[PDB]
Design a protein around this nucleic acid. Structure first.
Lengths: 195, 99, 107, 121, 93, 192
RNA sequence: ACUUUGCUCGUUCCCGUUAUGGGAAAAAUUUUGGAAGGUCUUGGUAGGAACGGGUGGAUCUUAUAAUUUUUGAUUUAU
RNA sequence: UUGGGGCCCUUUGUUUCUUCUGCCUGGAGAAGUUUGACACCAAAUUCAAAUUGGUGUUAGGGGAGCUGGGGCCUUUCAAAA
RNA sequence: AUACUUACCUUAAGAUAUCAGAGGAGAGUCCUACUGAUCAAACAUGCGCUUCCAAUAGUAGAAGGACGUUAAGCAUUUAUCAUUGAACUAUAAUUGUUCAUUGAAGUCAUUGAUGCAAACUCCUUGGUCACACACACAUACGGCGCGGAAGGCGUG
RNA sequence: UGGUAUGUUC
C-alpha cells in the first residue's frame, strides 16, 4: 500500500507505474507547490527572537545614560502598520521574483542571439527544454492561446536582418527609480527631448 | 525445492536435518565431543578453541581461546589467551578439526 | 537458532569488542538489535600496535584527550569482528535457548 | 564533552540530537538526525563532513590537528558505508518543550482530522 | 515496508542533488527518477573523479550500493515525512 | 517476491516430442491472447496451458532454418478468429448501444417537437428553424460526445486533441489487439 | 510440648503485706499493614472505559547466511 | 483612586492569542475564543470583488473548587516480641 | 460539484514480553478480570546524590565556528609523452641537454598545494537569578536558597 | 469487491 503525504490520498499495492503517474498529475502538483510555498513562507516569517538577558547595570552608566537625553518613540495605528507591512511584503516578494533582463533585450539583433539567448537551441540545457514540453493533453490548453510562437531557429544567419536600424527596434527602457524617493528627481532636463 | 514454497514454521526442522546430515557435521562433532578446533580468520587470527554453540550465520561461541597472529615487518608471532569469545561467521575463512 | 538472542540476554555486561577495523572497545552493553546493532556506554576504545584509517577513526570521535574515552557508542553489525565476554559470567545458564526449547516442545 | 548521553536510549529516543557519526573511511559526519530505517539510513540536517589529511596523519600518530571540513547541509547518508554513531551535542529546545510541542502537534492533528470529517460531510 | 529515507529520496525528484560514490567520485546534477532500490538516474551531471579532475556527463545512472551519500536541497528540511503524529484519514477497505 | 533471488530462481525454474498439449501453441508461435491481457480490465483470467521460454527458443531456432509446423499456426489462427469474433460482437454491441442512445424516446420526442415547429421570407424562416434544429441536435449529441473506436471498439472523442488520443493508443489492450489484428490479417493473406 | 504442685527473680495495678506471695492486665511501651483528620509541597482539570475491525503506524520470526546495505574483498602485505 | 522612586519596553507590526481604535507629554480601551474564529500563499474566472485547494495561530501568569501522588503529626483496628 | 470514456494496478505470511504452578476443553495444543517472579512502557515521587547554568564593586569573558581579515604571511615541492632533423650523454619506446614539424587525451588552479605560527574583528548559546562584598578547613572544606538543562538510583 | 490519474457536458 502507498499513501501520499501531500495529496492525502491512498493507493492500492505499491506499483511503480501508478506512483510515477501520481507525481505527474495536476492535483499533486498544485498541493505540493502550495505546501512548499507555505512552508518556505512560514520558515521565513517565523521571527525567532533571542531570549533577553537583563543584568543589573552599573551605577555610572545609570548616571550617564539618564542625563544625556530622552529620545522620542514613533508608533502607528493598526490599519497603518497593517498596510505598511503588506506593502513591504509585496515589495519583498516582487524583489525576490524579479531579475535583471537587460542583456537579453540588449543583444537582440546579435548574430549569435539564436545560439545562446534563445534558450531552446542552447547546447547543455536545450535537451531539457526540448524534453518536457508539458505536451498539453487538454484541448483547451492548446485552444486558449491564439498568439504567435515566434520560435527562433538556430539556422538564422547574418544575411537575415542586415541593417538593425531599418527594421524597427525598440528604444531601451529608462533606469527605474524608487517611487518613495521619486520627488527628488531633477525636474529640468539637460537637453530638449521631443515626444 | 524452492525455499519460499516449502512450508510455514517447519523450516527449523529442515535446518536441524541439514545440521545433522550436511556440511555442519564438523561443528556438530566439535560441540558434542569437546575437541579443540583451529579456525583461520580473514586477518591471520588463528584460533585454537572448543566450540560451544552453532548458528545459521556460523556465529560460534568459543571457550579457552588461544589465538595467534604473525606481524611481518621483522617476523614475530603474537599470541593471546582469551577465556570467552563470540566469533562472527563473516571473519571465518576455514575450520579444521583435529582427530 | 540465531545467537543474537543470546546477546539480548547480556544486558549490563561489561565486555570488549574487537572490530574489523582493528579497534578494541571496552564498555558495558545496554541493548542490541536483532540485526546486532549494539549500543554501549562508559566506553574506552583503543587502536593497538599502523592502520592510518583506524587512527583517523579513533581520533575523529570526540573525547580523545591513544585511549579514547566516550560516553555512548552505537556499533553497526557488519563492523563487529568479535566480542569478548567476561569470564565470570556463566555461559551454561545464559545459553539455555528457551525459544529453541519451545520449538523442540512444539515438535 | 559533558553531555551525558542517555543510558537506556535507542534510535527512536536519540532523534533530533547532533550526532557525530563515524564511517569506514573515517569521514565523520556531524549533524542532526531526523529519520532512520532498518538499514540505518540517516538523514542529517546542517551536516558537516570532516576528514584528516595524509600529512596530518603523521602528526596524529604517537597538540593540534587541522581537520578538513566540508559543508553538506541537509544530506541523506546510507547505512552500508558507516561504522559507528555517537551523540555529540544536545539540541536547542528541551524535553519538556518537545513534550509541549508534541502535544500541540497531536491537538493540531486531531483538529485536522475533525476538519476532514467536517469536509467529508 | 519501504521506510522514510527511500521516500525522501523519491521525494526530491527533478532537483539538483549531489552524490558521492564509494570510490570518491562526486556527482552533481538533476535527479531524473529515483527508485526504491536507490538506483538513481541523474541529468546535467558534473563529475569529479577521485584523481581530482572534473568532467561532464549528460545522463548518468548509478547503482544504489555504490553511493556514499546524496544531498537533497534544504527546503526538504520541513517535510510531512518528518511529522511524528500525523494521523491517517480513513484508509480504504 | 520480496527478495530478488527468489525471482531469479523462479526465472531459472520456468526457463529450464515437442507436440504436446501442455505447451501453449499460441505462445509457442507468439503473442498469446491470454498473455496480452494479463493484468488489465479486459483480463481473461489465467491461461490453462503452460508457457515456456526454452520451447519458444527451440521453436524460433526451428523456424529460423529447420522447418515450420502448420498445426500450431492453425490453432493460433482459430484462437485469433474466435477472439476477433468475440471482439467484433462486443463492438457491435457497443454500436447498438450508441444507436440506442442516439435514438432515445425523450430525445426523439424533443426532435419531433422541434421539427414540427420547423415549418424568400418563408425559406429564410425555414433555414433559421433548420439551423436551430441542428444546434439542438448538436447540443443533444454533445451531452455524451462519445465516438466508436474503429479498431479496438472502445470510445473516443472528436473534440479531444491528439495528445490524449495518443495516450489512449499506447496501452496494453490496444497494442495487443493491433498485434492480434496484424497476425489475423497476415494469416488471412497467407491462407487466401 | 501439655499438666499440677510450692520456691526464687521480675513490667504494671490491686490484695494478704511492703520480707514476700496471691490474683488480674496476662499490660505501659517498639515495628508492620489497613480506616479517618490536620498541616507542607507538586501535577492535571475535558476527556475517559468496553467491543468491533477484508483499521493505520511501530516490535519479533521466516523468506533473507548468495549482486541492493545487515553475515564482509578497506589494517595494502606478494 | 492619586502621587513619588528603581528597572524594562528588542514588545524592533511598542506586547506576539486574534480583530478594531490608538500610543512615548506613554505602558490604554472595546469584542471574541476548538464541530468555531483569525492571518497568509497559489490560481482560471480579463480592475476591485467573489469561488476552490493548503499553510500557521488560538497564548502566558496568579486565585477558588475537584482529583492523583510524596513527607510529618494525631485518633482507631489486626498481628509479632 | 454531479454524469461518462480512457491509462496503470488490485494485496509475503504468523504474532504482540518471559518463567513456574493450579483449573477447564478431545503424548501434543488453547484459555483463565487465575496465582507468584523477572522485564518493558507511561504517570507521579524522593534520594544532605552526579555535571552545567557568562562582570556589571565592568566596558570584560566561557563554549562552537567563520564556508573572515592581516595573508600573494614564513619555509618547501611539482606544472605532459613519442618520431625525425643540426651536435649529443648513451643498456629503453634517443631517456639527458638547445631549437623546431607532427601525432592521442590535455582539471581550473602557481595570487595554486602542504606544514608552521601570532594578532584583530564578527556570529549562536546561557538564571547574564535571591541575600551579602563577608575569615573556612585533615573525617579538607557547614553541597541546610528559588529554580532550569542532562543523567544515575530507589518507591507507588 | 476497488484505488490513482486524466479529458468532455451541466
Amino acid at each position: 500500500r502507498y499513501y501520499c503525504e501531500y495529496c492525502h490520498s491512498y493507493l492500492t499495492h505499491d506499483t511503480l507505474s501508478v506512483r510515477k503517474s501520481h507525481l505527474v498529475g495536476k492535483n499533486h502538483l498544485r498541493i505540493t507547490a502550495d505546501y512548499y510555498r507555505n512552508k518556505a513562507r512560514d520558515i521565513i516569517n517565523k521571527h525567532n527572537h533571542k531570549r533577553r538577558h537583563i543584568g543589573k547595570r552599573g551605577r555610572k552608566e545609570r548616571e550617564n545614560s539618564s542625563q544625556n537625553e530622552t529620545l522620542k518613540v514613533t508608533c502607528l495605528s493598526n490599519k497603518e502598520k497593517r498596510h505598511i507591512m503588506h506593502v513591504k511584503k509585496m515589495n519583498q516578494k516582487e524583489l525576490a521574483q524579479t531579475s535583471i533582463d537587460t542583456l537579453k533585450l540588449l543583444y537582440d539583433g546579435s548574430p549569435g542571439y539564436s545560439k545562446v539567448f534563445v534558450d531552446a537551441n542552447r547546447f547543455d540545457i536545450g535537451d531539457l527544454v526540448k524534453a518536457s514540453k508539458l505536451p498539453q493533453r487538454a484541448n483547451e490548453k492548446s485552444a486558449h492561446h491564439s498568439f504567435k510562437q515566434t520560435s527562433r531557429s538556430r539556422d538564422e544567419t547574418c544575411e537575415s536582418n542586415p541593417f538593425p536600424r531599418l527594421n524597427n527596434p525598440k528604444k531601451l527602457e529608462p533606469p527605474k527609480i524608487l517611487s518613495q524617493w521619486s520627488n527628488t528627481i531633477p525636474k529640468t532636463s539637460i537637453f530638449y527631448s521631443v515626444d | 525445492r524452492p525455499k519460499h514454497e516449502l512450508s510455514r514454521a517447519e523450516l527449523e526442522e529442515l535446518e536441524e536435518f541439514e545440521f545433522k546430515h550436511g556440511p555442519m557435521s564438523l561443528i556438530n562433532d566439535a560441540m558434542v565431543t569437546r575437541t579443540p578446533v583451529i579456525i583461520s580468520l580473514r586477518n591471520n587470527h588463528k584460533i585454537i578453541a572448543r566450540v560451544k554453540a552453532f548458528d545459521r550465520h556460523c556465529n560460534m561461541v568459543l571457550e579457552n581461546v588461544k589465538e595467534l597472529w604473525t606481524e611481518k615487518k621483522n617476523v614475530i608471532n603474537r599470541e593471546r589467551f582469551i577465556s570467552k569469545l563470540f566469533l562472527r561467521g563473516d571473519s571465518v575463512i576455514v575450520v579444521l578439526k583435529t582427530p | 537458532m540465531k545467537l543474537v538472542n543470546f546477546l539480548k540476554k547480556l544486558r549490563n555486561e561489561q565486555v570488549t569488542i574487537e572490530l574489523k577495523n582493528g579497534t578494541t572497545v571496552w564498555g558495558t552493553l545496554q541493548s542490541v538489535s536483532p540485526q546486532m546493532n549494539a549500543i554501549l556506554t562508559d566506553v574506552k576504545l583503543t587502536l593497538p600496535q599502523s592502520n592510518g584509517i583506524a587512527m583517523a577513526s579513533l581520533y575523529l570521535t570526540g573525547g580523545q584527550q591513544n585511549i579514547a574515552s566516550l560516553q555512548y557508542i552505537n556499533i553497526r553489525g557488519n563492523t563487529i569482528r568479535q566480542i569478548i565476554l567476561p569470564d565470570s559470567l556463566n555461559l551454561d545458564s545464559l545459553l539455555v535457548d528457551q525459544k529453541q526449547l519451545n520449538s523442540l516442545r512444539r515438535s | 564533552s559533558k553531555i551525558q548521553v542517555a543510558h537506556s536510549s535507542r534510535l527512536a529516543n536519540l532523534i533530533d540530537y547532533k550526532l557525530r557519526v563515524l564511517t569506514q573511511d573515517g569521514r565523520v559526519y556531524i549533524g542532526q538526525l531526523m529519520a532512520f530505517d532498518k538499514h540505518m539510513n540517516l538523514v542529517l540536517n546542517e551536516c558537516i563532513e570532516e576528514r584528516v589529511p595524509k600529512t596530518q596523519l603523521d602528526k596524529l600518530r604517537p597538540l593540534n590537528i587541522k581537520v578538513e571540513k566540508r559543508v553538506l547541509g541537509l544530506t541523506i547518508l546510507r547505512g552500508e558505508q558507516i561504522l559507528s554513531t555517537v551523540v555529540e551535542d544536545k539540541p536547542l529546545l528541551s524535553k519538556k518543550e518537545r513534550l509541549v510541542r508534541d502535544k500541540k502537534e497531536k491537538k493540531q492533528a486531531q483538529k485536522q482530522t475533525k476538519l476532514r470529517k467536517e469536509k467529508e460531510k | 515496508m519501504n521506510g522514510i529515507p527511500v521516500k525522501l529520496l523519491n521525494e526530491a525528484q527533478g532537483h539538483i542533488v549531489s552524490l558521492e560514490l564509494t570510490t570518491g567520485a562526486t556527482y552533481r546534477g538533476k535527479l531524473v527518477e529515483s527508485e526504491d532500490s536507490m538506483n538513481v538516474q541523474l541529468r546535467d551531471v558534473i563529475a569529479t573523479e577521485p584523481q581530482g579532475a572534473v568532467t561532464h556527463m549528460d545522463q548518468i545512472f548509478v547503482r544504489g550500493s555504490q553511493i556514499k551519500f546524496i544531498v537533497v536541497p534544504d527546503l526538504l528540511k520541513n517535510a510531512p515525512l518528518f511529522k511524528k503524529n500525523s494521523s491517517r484519514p480513513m484508509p480504504p477497505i | 517476491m520480496s527478495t530478488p533471488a527468489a525471482e531469479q530462481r523462479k526465472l531459472v525454474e520456468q526457463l529450464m516430442g515437442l507436440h504436446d498439449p501442455k505447451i501453449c501453441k499460441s505462445y509457442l508461435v507468439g503473442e498469446c491472447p491470454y498473455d496480452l491481457f494479463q493484468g488489465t480490465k479486459q483480463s481473461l483470467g489465467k491461461c490453462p496451458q503452460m508457457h515456456l521460454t526454452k520451447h519458444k527458443i527451440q521453436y524460433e531456432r526451428e523456424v529460423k532454418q529447420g522447418k515450420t509446423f502448420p498445426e500450431f499456426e492453425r490453432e493460433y489462427l482459430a484462437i485469433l478468429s474466435r477472439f476477433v469474433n468475440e471482439c467484433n460482437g462486443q463492438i457491435s454491441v457497443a454500436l447498438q448501444n450508441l444507436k440506442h442512445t442516439a435514438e432515445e424516446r425523450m430525445k426523439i420526442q424533443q426532435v419531433t417537437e422541434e421539427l414540427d415547429v420547423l415549418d424568400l421570407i418563408s425559406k429564410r424562416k425555414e433555414v433559421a428553424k433548420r439551423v436551430r434544429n441542428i444546434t439542438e441536435n448538436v447540443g443533444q449529441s454533445a451531452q455524451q460526445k462519445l465516438q466508436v473506436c474503429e479498431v479496438c471498439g472502445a470510445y473516443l472523442s472528436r473534440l479531444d486533441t491528439d495528445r490524449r488520443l495518443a495516450d489512449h493508443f499506447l496501452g496494453k489492450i490496444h497494442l495487443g489487439y493491433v498485434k492480434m489484428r496484424e497476425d489475423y490479417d497476415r494469416l488471412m493473406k497467407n491462407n487466401r
